[PDB]
Amino acid sequence: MQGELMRTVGDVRNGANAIYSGASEIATGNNDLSSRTEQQAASLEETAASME
């Protein structure tokens, strides 16, 4: 019973870390992607100003 419990704890604990680390990649991607969105919108403001 302990063998299956320790194995489950290890698989869940080690696997849970992958979700936390993997989730950080998505959060980091949104942060980096968010920066491009701000610059993307800024280009429209600068580009729209040129049309004026």
Binding site: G15, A16, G22, G29, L33, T37, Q39, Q40
Partner: peptide, 29 residues
């Protein structure tokens, strides 16, 4: 810049899909 955003969208989708697989591994244990 649009191409860079697409790379992050696909990367986020690919990373998000990986979490779906990790969640399945928890059920296997």
């Amino acid at each position: 810049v649009t191409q860079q955003n697409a790379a992050l969208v696909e990367e986020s989708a690919a990373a998000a899909a990986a979490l779906e697989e990790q969640a399945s591994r928890l059920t296997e244990a």
